[PDB]
C-alpha cells in the first residue's frame, strides 16, 4: 500500500503512547460538497485510561451548508440539537483547529498517535480536506474500534451482545468504552 | 461520525458475507497529486478462506506522473520491477476498474463486503478519487488489518513476534494470513 520518504509545556502524563481519540460529525459523506459541523477529542493512554478532554466544538455553519444534509443527517442532527448548536456558533474550523491542536500539544506529541475511534477512516478523510493542520497531527496509523466490532460480529457474534447520539462527545466515549470491553472480552487481556 | 440516508452468474459459493481484500500501489500519499499504479484484489470466505484472486493490474502512467515518486517510492517501485510494469502496460483505470468490477461480481454482491487489507484507509481514499466505481461497490465497513496489528504491539508485543514486497498481490495475500494469525494467536478462535 501506502510508502514515502516518511512512510516506509504540558501534563506529567505526557507520552509518545498516548492516544488521540476523535469524532466529528458532518453535513453528509462527501468531503468535497459537506462540512464538518462538530468535533470532539480525548486523550487515553496506551491502556485507554482518559487522561484529559478536549474541546467539544460546534462549528458554525450557513444554512447553504445545512441545506445539504439529506433526511436522515437533518433528523438526527436537529433532534440532537447539533443544528442549533452549529446556527449559534461564532466557530470557524480555522479556530476549531487552532483550539484543538492546542489542547493535543500538552499530552502527545505531533505524528505520534494514531488516529483512534469508531468511523475513523471517514472521519479521517473531512480531516484532510477541512483540517489538514490538524489531520497532520495525527501518525499515519489508525486504531479503528468499528474494525473489531465487525470482525467479532462474524466471529464471536454472542460476545458481541454482551456491549450496549451522534453527538461527537458522546460517539468518542463510547467508543473508548466499545474498545475497553473488547480488550477484556475478545481480546482477553 | 458519518451518517446519511444510506448510512444508518457467479461461483457456488457466492455470498452477502464474502470479503474483498484489495491493494493499492500508488506514486505517492496524496490522492489530488498521485496516482494508482498497482492493483490487486482476493475473494475470501467470512473465515478467511481464499475463494478467488483477482487480477493483479499495473496501471499505465506517463513518466510525467512516475517523476512525482518521492525516492522511497522511486526507489521501492523500481527496484520491485513495478516502474517497468507500469511503463509497458496498456491498462488504464477505466479498464481496472472494469476488468476489477467484472471479477468481483462472481464473488459478493455490490455494497455488501467491508472494505479489507492493511493501510486499508489509505486505499479507499485514492479509490474515491480515481476509482469512485470501484469505491461504490464496497460497504461502507472497513476491516482495517493494521489496526489489530497496532493494538497487540501495545497490548501482547511478545504474541506480535511469532508472525513474520510493495506488490500488491504480495501484500493482500500477507494480509490474509496476518487477520489469519491474529484471528488464532490474538481472538483466540
Same mark, same amino acid.
Given at each position: 500500500?501506502? &510508502? ?15 492516544? $488521540? +481519540?476523535?469524532? #466529528?460529525?458532518?453535513? @453528509?459523506?462527501? *468531503?468535497?460538497?459537506?462540512?464538518? $459541523? ?12 482518559? #487522561?484529559?478532554?478536549?474541546?467539544? $466544538?460546534?462549528?458554525? %455553519? ?9 433526511? +436522515? ?7 440532537? @440539537? ?7 456558533? %461564532? ?9 484543538? &491542536?492546542?489542547?493535543?500539544? %500538552?499530552?502527545?506529541?505531533? @505524528? =505520534?498517535?494514531?488516529?483512534? @475511534? ?8 473531512? &480531516?484532510? =480536506?477541512?483540517? *489538514?493542520?490538524?489531520? /497532520? ?19 464471536? *457474534? ?17 467508543? $473508548?468504552?466499545?474498545? %475497553?470491553?473488547?480488550? =477484556? /472480552?475478545?481480546?482477553?487481556?
Amino acid at each position: 500500500g501506502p &510508502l514515502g520518504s516518511h512512510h516506509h509545556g504540558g501534563s506529567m502524563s505526557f507520552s509518545d503512547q498516548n492516544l $488521540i +481519540w476523535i469524532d #466529528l460529525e458532518m453535513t @453528509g459523506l462527501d *468531503p468535497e460538497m459537506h462540512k464538518i $459541523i462538530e468535533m470532539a477529542t480525548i486523550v487515553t493512554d496506551s491502556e485507554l485510561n482518559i #487522561l484529559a478532554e478536549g474541546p467539544v $466544538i460546534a462549528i458554525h %455553519q450557513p444554512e447553504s451548508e445545512l441545506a445539504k444534509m439529506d433526511e +436522515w443527517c437533518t433528523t438526527t442532527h436537529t433532534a440532537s @440539537g447539533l443544528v442549533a448548536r452549529v446556527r449559534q456558533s %461564532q466557530v470557524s474550523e480555522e479556530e476549531a483547529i487552532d483550539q484543538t &491542536l492546542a489542547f493535543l500539544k %500538552q499530552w502527545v506529541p505531533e @505524528g =505520534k498517535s494514531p488516529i483512534c @475511534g469508531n468511523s475513523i477512516g471517514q472521519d479521517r478523510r473531512f &480531516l484532510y =480536506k477541512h483540517m *489538514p493542520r490538524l489531520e /497532520a497531527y495525527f501518525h499515519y496509523r489508525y486504531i479503528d474500534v468499528s474494525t473489531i466490532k465487525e470482525l467479532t460480529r462474524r466471529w464471536q *457474534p454472542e460476545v458481541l451482545k454482551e456491549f450496549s447520539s451522534h453527538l461527537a462527545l458522546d460517539d468518542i466515549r463510547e467508543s $473508548i468504552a466499545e474498545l %475497553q470491553f473488547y480488550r =477484556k /472480552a475478545v481480546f482477553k487481556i
